[PDB]
Amino acid sequence: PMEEEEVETFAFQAEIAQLMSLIINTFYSNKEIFLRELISNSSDALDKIRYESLTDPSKLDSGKELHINLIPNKQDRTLTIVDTGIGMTKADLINNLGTIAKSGTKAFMEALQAGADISMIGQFGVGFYSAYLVAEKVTVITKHNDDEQYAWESSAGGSFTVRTDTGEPMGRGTKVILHLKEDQTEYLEERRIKEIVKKHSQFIGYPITLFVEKE
Numbered sequence: 001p002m003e004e005e006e007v008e009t010f011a012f013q014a015e016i017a018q019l020m021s022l023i024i025n026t027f028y029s030n031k032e033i034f035l036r037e038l039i040s041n042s043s044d045a046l047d048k049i050r051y052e053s054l055t056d057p058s059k060l061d062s063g064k065e066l067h068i069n070l071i072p073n074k075q076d077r078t079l080t081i082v083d084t085g086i087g088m089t090k091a092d093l094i095n096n097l098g099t100i101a102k103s104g105t106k107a108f109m110e111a112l113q114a115g116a117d118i119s120m121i122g123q124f125g126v127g128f129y130s131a132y133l134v135a136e137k138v139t140v141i142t143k144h145n146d147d148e149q150y151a152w153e154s155s156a157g158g159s160f161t162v163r164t165d166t167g168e169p170m171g172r173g174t175k176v177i178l179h180l181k182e183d184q185t186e187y188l189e190e191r192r193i194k195e196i197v198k199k200h201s202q203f204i205g206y207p208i209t210l211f212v213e214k215e
């Protein structure tokens with residue numbers, strides 16, 4: 001029978017919306033740094049659970065291994081980045097991925113409009129948004145201990161949605177699904193992914209595995 005699901009639609013904070021437009025509608029070379037930002041964001045979450053579990057071992061009930069998986073899908077044109085970090089509560093998602101102002105947004109847009117390399121985005125504290133260099137739509141699935149699993153999604157244009165996720169359960173962590181733009185499909189190629197992880201993500205303190213579908 002028919003199922004019902006609640007959705008909540010949110011507006012991006014004004015300067016965050018402006019940044020997204022700037023990222024989306026301006027040409028940048030060096031778009032590859034998007035993956036560095038995602039792995040760094042995963043690494044941040046992995047540190048958080050690592051140290052939490054030193055206090056309370058019953059925070060690792062939801063899964064012991066701390067790692068990152070990269071999953072390209074050439075048929076769907078998606079690149080999926082999965083971690084077993086601390087995850088996000090509903091309030092974490094809404095606040096941290098779009099509604100609360102970030103202190104670095106205006107500085108970064110100013111820097112960028114003066115010719116700064118897009119690679120600086122991480123240092124301005126808004127690196128998540130680099131996903132929109134290569135992705136037309138981003139879905140973030142997340143599971144925090146003692147909260148339910150949520151899905152966040154945005155195609156930009158100034159809004160995002162959040163809903164309880166009735167899809168495949170994750171133990172704990174965050175899964176980012178990048179629906180890549182048509183001219184950005186090189187980031188589905190095994191060689192290219194290896195190249196950029198090597199160049200930009202070599203000092204990560206957690207194992208990363210690349211899963212490649214049989215050609």
Ligand SMILES: NS(=O)(=O)c1ccc(CNC(=O)c2cn[nH]c2-c2cc(Cl)c(O)cc2O)cc1
Binds near residue numbers: 041045
């Ligand atoms: N939106 S933003 O300001 O650029 C941003 C958002 C999140 C982060 C760091 N990551 C986290 O805080 C976190 C906590 N639990 N899960 C995450 C997480 C978030 C993101 Cl965006 C991710 O791609 C992977 C994650 O594991 C850094 C910067």
